[PDB]
Design a protein around this nucleic acid. Structure first.
Lengths: 141, 185, 221, 83
RNA sequence: CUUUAAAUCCUUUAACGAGGAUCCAUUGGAGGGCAAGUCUGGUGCCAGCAGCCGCGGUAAUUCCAGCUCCAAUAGCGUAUAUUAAAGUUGCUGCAGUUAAAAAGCUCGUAGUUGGAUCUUGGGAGCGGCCG
């Protein structure tokens, strides 16, 4: 510290206060703009409906195309591009079904070689995608 | 408005570094030589030893001739004597920190019935503890994680309802006897 | 095969005239023969390899790479060591590293925490070491608490013979050479500290040169 | 260091500078165990006893070693007070 | 039998209740952090994996399967809010020449901080100067 007196507390209050608001993580976690911009509204998971399936390309150092699902939410009703994770799973999700959209890991950031997509799919039609992948449970048609 | 307990504490802790070599190898070594089951046993013993060491450090950081310090020091010293880890010859507050985890593991009932000679092997010892066979002061015990006090040592023997302790024959022996009497009859 | 001296130091430790190395650290006298350590420190001296990091140049034709072998050394009751060697391939780099680690050896003094009972187990004071941006601290610790540090100073402290310490680091810790040199400088400054124990004005013992010059004036000229 | 048993746990006693009262370490090579000879009392000869001195590296590093050897020789009595 | 308002739960105890104990232990992994295959087959920048770096272009120690293996084990993995690690909000305990950072300069009211100095010493004794 700099102000090293005894009868001073208010300047140290206001300075630590203002330099704490000058941070970016504290300004993200304590303003309503970051919570308003997030489509989940503070939720961890959220359910939505499939309306169109659009694939997106990769980034520069690795060349592929990654298959994704575009989902309109139920609680909010905003267009959010999710991403079906596993191999050979776009044939399991079709038009107009119930999905469970979740985060992918970097606290609402675009992750890796997928541009502009930050959300994934963990459950479809109230059955888990891992059991559909491993073949222990069958999708109810 | 209910009359319940709501009291619980975790007896184990997990180390900060999950993957490395030396501590994993020595915990595996201790599990091998003392016939334990998993890592939660040694984590529990390390946690209670750390709590004892923290209490000893909190006692040592205060000055001499304080009678709260004298009371908890004498009580903790008498407790570690009564468990049987510390000796009566060296009964001072600074000898708490000169202890290892194997001294706490040595007062296990599994290791005690293994070293007493009634159990042939340490795996056989843990099995026989679980098997409803022993009795300590005429009371049977299922539980290998039993901290044996020093004075309750000579009163360990098989139960009276045990086939090795004299009494009814076993279920497999009576089944084979029934089969033999049916075949020879 | 059989070792022949270069200085008179090898001569005096060869003809059974120097009792220990402790008088050599007493007279602050440099040792530049690594096999004197082989003679006086026996099988308790053990070896380990810290990090093999390659470095490379830049010319017209490719990048000429060379290995940098980091090796510390030290017997588990007393002395330590550290060696930095950079040769062409890895085996000669390792051998030069263990030779230079046997060369640069400082002793350590072991102290106590608060109460004064028994054999020593701890650094006697808050010492520190700095090189580059690494600040390694050694805080005295109660008995049986174990080493609380990063893995490689934990290794250096267990081959130092010091069982219980607390540390505090600062800076770019990811550079292993600077971090290891900083904790070596911290552990070398143990004697380089004035304490009330050292207040007895010692007498000056006669030098081994001054009492063995009657042999080294006639053996080698 | 002393102990409760009365046994010194010291492994080697380090020497001390006679000028600035500091300690010469194990890997300091700028230190000299200086020996000074005294004259025989009657005419001019050499007895055999020694008047030893020591100095650390920092005093020679800043360069005040001649001053220190004069003060030590004057304190032991080799150099007269008038000087 | 016991328990209890009467039961269920627990303890005790007759008759039963095992050998490939099928009376079958899973969950995430094996390039670095990060403990653990340059094993064998298939597509060979497609499929995909990957929290970060990156791995896939025809001998993939990172993909998809078999065997082997390692971590915890009735438990294990993912997402989000938070804490230690953060000496990257620093009162203990940060930085301001060149990496982020001293207002163009001076005065100035609130606020913080503020030079020295006012009372010493002894006695009887516990004993061979002092606790």
């Amino acid at each position: 510290g700099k102000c090293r007196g005894l009868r001073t507390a208010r300047k140290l209050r206001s300075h630590r206060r203002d330099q704490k608001w000058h941070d970016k993580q504290y300004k993200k976690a304590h303003l309503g703009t970051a919570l308003k911009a997030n489509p989940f509204g503070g939720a961890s998971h959220a359910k939505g409906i499939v309306l169109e399936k659009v694939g997106v390309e990769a980034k520069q150092p690795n060349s592929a195309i990654r298959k994704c699902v575009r989902v309109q939410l139920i609680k909010n009703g905003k267009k959010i591009t999710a991403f079906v994770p596993n191999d050979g799973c776009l044939n399991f999700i079709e038009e107009n079904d119930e999905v469970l959209v979740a985060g992918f890991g970097r606290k609402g950031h675009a992750v890796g070689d997928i541009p502009g997509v930050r959300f994934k799919v963990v459950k479809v039609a109230n059955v888990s995608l891992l059991a559909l992948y491993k073949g222990k449970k069958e999708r109810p048609r | 408005p209910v009359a319940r307990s709501w009291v619980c504490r975790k007896t184990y802790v997990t180390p900060r570094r999950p993957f490395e070599k030396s501590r994993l190898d020595q915990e595996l070594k201790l599990i091998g030589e003392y016939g334990l089951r998993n890592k939660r046993e040694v984590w529990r013993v390390k946690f209670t030893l750390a709590k004892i060491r923290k209490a000893a450090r909190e006692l040592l950081t205060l000055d001499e001739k304080d009678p709260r310090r004298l009371f908890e020091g004498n009580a903790l010293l008498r407790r570690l004597v009564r468990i049987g880890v510390l000796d009566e010859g060296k009964m001072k507050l600074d000898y708490i920190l000169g202890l290892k985890i194997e001294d706490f593991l040595e007062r296990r009932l599994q290791t005690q019935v293994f070293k007493l000679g009634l159990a042939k092997s340490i795996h056989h010892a843990r099995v026989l503890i679980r098997q409803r066979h022993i009795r300590v002061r005429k009371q049977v015990v299922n539980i290998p994680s039993f901290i044996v006090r020093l004075d309750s040592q000579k009163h360990i023997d098989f139960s009276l309802r045990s086939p090795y302790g004299g009494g009814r024959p076993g279920r497999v022996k009576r089944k084979n006897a029934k089969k033999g009497q049916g075949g020879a009859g | 095969k059989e070792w022949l001296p270069v200085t008179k130091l090898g001569r005096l430790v060869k003809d059974m005239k120097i009792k220990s190395l402790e008088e050599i650290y007493l007279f602050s006298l440099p040792i530049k023969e690594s096999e004197i350590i082989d003679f006086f420190l026996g099988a308790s001296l053990k070896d380990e390899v810290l990090k093999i990091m390659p470095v490379q140049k830049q010319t017209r034709a490719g990048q000429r790479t060379r290995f940098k072998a980091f090796v510390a050394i030290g017997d588990y009751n007393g002395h330590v060591g550290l060696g930095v060697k950079c040769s062409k391939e890895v085996a000669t780099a390792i051998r030069g590293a263990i030779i230079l680690a046997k060369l640069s050896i400082v002793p350590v003094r072991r102290g106590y925490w608060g109460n004064k009972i028994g054999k020593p187990h701890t650094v006697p004071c808050k010492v520190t070491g700095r090189c580059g941006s690494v600040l390694v601290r050694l805080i005295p610790a109660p008995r049986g608490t174990g080493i609380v540090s990063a893995p490689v100073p934990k290794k250096l402290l267990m081959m130092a013979g010091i069982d219980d310490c607390y540390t505090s680091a600062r800076g770019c810790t990811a550079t292993l050479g600077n971090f290891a040199k900083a904790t070596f400088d911290a552990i070398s400054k143990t004697y380089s500290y004035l304490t009330p124990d050292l207040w007895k004005e010692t007498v000056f013992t006669k030098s081994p040169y001054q009492e063995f010059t009657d042999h080294l004036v006639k053996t080698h000229t | 260091m002393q102990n409760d048993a009365g046994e010194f746990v010291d492994l080697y006693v380090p020497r001390k500078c006679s000028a600035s009262n500091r300690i010469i370490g194990a890997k300091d090579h700028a230190s000299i165990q200086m020996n000074v000879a005294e004259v025989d009392k009657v005419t001019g000869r050499f007895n055999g006893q020694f008047k030893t001195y020591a100095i650390c590296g920092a005093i020679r590093r800043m360069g005040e070693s001649d001053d220190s050897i004069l003060r030590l020789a004057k304190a032991d009595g080799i150099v007269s007070k008038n000087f």
